[PDB]
Symmetry: none
Subunit: 140 residues, 7 copies
């Protein structure tokens, strides 16, 4: 591929998902989480030049954040909080862009990945009630 | 034109105001929402208003002809019964404003030259999206 | 005009005033205010190459601040505090210059304008006992 | 060839004018009265100390200014009105030197900046009124 | 063509060397415990190689992963340890040339501030714990 | 003189001292001070190209600091704390160099002098049991 | 010499030592019990010998490895003054934002000369009695 694949972190649960577009970058990402369970429950992605919302997980959470990404905007800093192991869950995400935009979703109470940086082109993982595992995908 | 996600509820009357030289946010401590927004444009003296100026606070941001939004955050209640609660804007000249409350959900929007606003208002600002120039 | 007019903020009361010189900018501005009423009461302005003092409002306040402005010195940051509505008043002013000078007069308890920036050339509003309304005027 | 910052404070005291640039300036103030009482000034190529006011205060600060050194930041605290007094001074220089004398409880002037060339005002027992004077 | 940072901690554990002919680290995982306050397990991935190299026993209740871009160097590196023959490696702080930083474990006894540069591999000794850890850099 | 003399600050007491070497600058300066009396007691000075330690005052203080100065290193900030008057004393010294080296000695509880900056070439004042008075001397 | 010698700070005790050949590694051993340095090890560029002095009796150590092009921009040694003096701590900061901190700073301080750390010199037996840094020009 012409892509970089960040480690999927979290557990083995959920239905798999992959969100990529043939020559497309993420223009919008949404994280839904709960104070009650301290996990991510639901993720939405929009891509450049495509009106479709791609969604996974159950939007059961009392909070959401959206990050909109300009066409020339990169991720210069990215951290995913998670519970490790087979019954693991994805708990939080901090993103920071080349234009000083940042977002913070969920909780960071067990494990952390500091991912590869670049132009966010997609996400892969598994989800059901919760976001079980999550990995970012970048352009090279 | 770049259209930023309209955030908040499906309630109130649609509006579309379409570069911005002045924007005013009216909010209340009682309901912790935006109620009223005014906009003035370059080379036009008409004031475009929406929602009800019920709130006990207002802020005005005046934008220079060559000034851009380098930072923009809208707080809101998600759901069909959603509301805009708050706006934070930061400009290319270190100017910044802060209206309302940021107690539930947040969007960090596209940046650029603020060229208009779309959404729905009645008693309150139900939904708000920014619009930028390319 | 070769002038930018910032929104006049506060109420409709008081006698209109406009302080502007045919080809001059403000070299000195003084704000009078009170802890008792938590409003601006009085403003004085001197201009480059003019020894007249232009005054408006009643100097009844227990506090004053003077900002002296060098000829090549601009405002880069400007905020006016006020009470909105017909019975509105101007409550405070924060100015910051291109040479790191700043001043702070009065109170910021209700409403705010972040104004246009530039070379402060004049002011315009209404005053009697109090500063009813205030708007800044800049060069282009 | 001089810029005159507003003289701030009262109408009281014997007038003074110190001009000849300032190489040294000393402020004397009291915690009892919360005012400046006394100021001394030395100038470049001149060993005379020019004083005004009564050095009754329990604190002093001296700022020595290098020959190429400017004031980039200057604030004088005062009581406004005819019975007015100069209550405090903050100076910051082009070399990151700063000083703080006295109190800032009532009124403030943020003065013009530049090469500090002299001072002017009135003083008897207290510093009644103080204006800075700058080169162009 | 390689710079060897001091191996810190004890003499115990099976030796290990993770390095690939003309290949730098792209991912490194540190597993540690609040119970024993040590590193227990390290995993490493290399550029153009899908094999995971692991050592120690993954019994810790915490992990951190640092992914390294191909042009990304280490500008700050601190390893926490207990000195002596019975020694252990207790913690790792890394900072990269792109403002990425990670923090694993505890810094309660001894500290090395290592050489900097392009992290090429790791060497030391591990069994149920990481006994000893040294970094390996390109020039 | 090809020297600049900073005001000597503190009292008229002790024995006069003047530490200068024709065509040599300070390479080391030691300050000794007391928590008990909150004053400087004793200073030493070494010069470039001279092994003689010049000392003054009584080294009775429980603390000392040494600043070594590289041949090309200037003082870019200098503050001396002191007690004003005939019975005055020198209580404290902060120095900062052109290479970001700083030292801090003693207490700053009464009066302050922010001195001239430049190449520290010598010191002057008076001392017996304590440092009564201290002035810095700079090159041009 | 083509070297700058920092003031040796501490007491007159100990066997004298001088380690010169630039430093690629320096290790400080110190105790919470006595709150002094006890032991220093140095390795040099292109030399496998470990040069050691004092007694490694302390419960803490710190190692600073120094890249070939890396200098000391900040340097503070903590000590007890007088003839029965000791060296109590070291703070070094490098041109690459690296810093280490060993032992205690409860009495006296030297802010030393800076530059490329080329060696050390002092006296030690049970403790580090005195410590001076050596720099290139
Ligand atoms: O004959 C005395 C006169 O006294 C009062 O009116 C005059 C002033 O009253 C003040 O309290 C105030 O209302 C002033 O109003 C001016 O200033 C206010 C505040 O800025 C402004 O809003 C107004 O527009 C005016 O500029 C009045 O001047 C009354 O008691 C009156 O009845 C009486 O005749
Ligand atoms: O009767 C007036 C005044 O009398 C007493 O003060 C008198 C003198 O006091 C001196 O200490 C000094 O204040 C003199 O005034 C000079 O100094 C002040 C301060 O700068 C200045 O305002 C004056 O202009 C003079 O230069 C006074 O004359 C006191 O009883 C006082 O309370 C009383 O009002
Ligand atoms: O027996 C001699 C002397 O003993 C006592 O004074 C000793 C010292 O006491 C110090 O506190 C101080 O007073 C000293 O004064 C000298 O040093 C100070 C500090 O620098 C200085 O200001 C003075 O100018 C002196 O040089 C004393 O030396 C007393 O019992 C005394 O009465 C007796 O002479």
């Amino acid at each position: 591929d012409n892509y970089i694949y960040s480690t999927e972190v979290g557990g083995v649960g959920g239905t798999p998902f992959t969100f990529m577009q043939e020559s497309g970058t993420i223009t919008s990402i949404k994280f839904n989480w709960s104070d009650q369970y301290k996990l991510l429950h639901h993720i939405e992605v929009k891509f450049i030049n495509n009106a479709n919302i791609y969604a996974t997980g159950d939007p059961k959470g009392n909070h959401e954040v959206i990050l909109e990404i300009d066409d020339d905007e990169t991720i210069i800093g990215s951290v995913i909080g998670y519970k490790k192991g087979n019954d693991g869950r994805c708990t939080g995400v901090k993103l920071t862009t080349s234009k000083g935009k940042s977002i913070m979703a969920g909780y960071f109470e067990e494990s952390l990945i500091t991912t590869y940086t670049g132009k966010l082109a997609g996400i892969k993982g598994g989800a059901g009630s919760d976001i079980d595992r999550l990995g970012l995908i970048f352009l090279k």
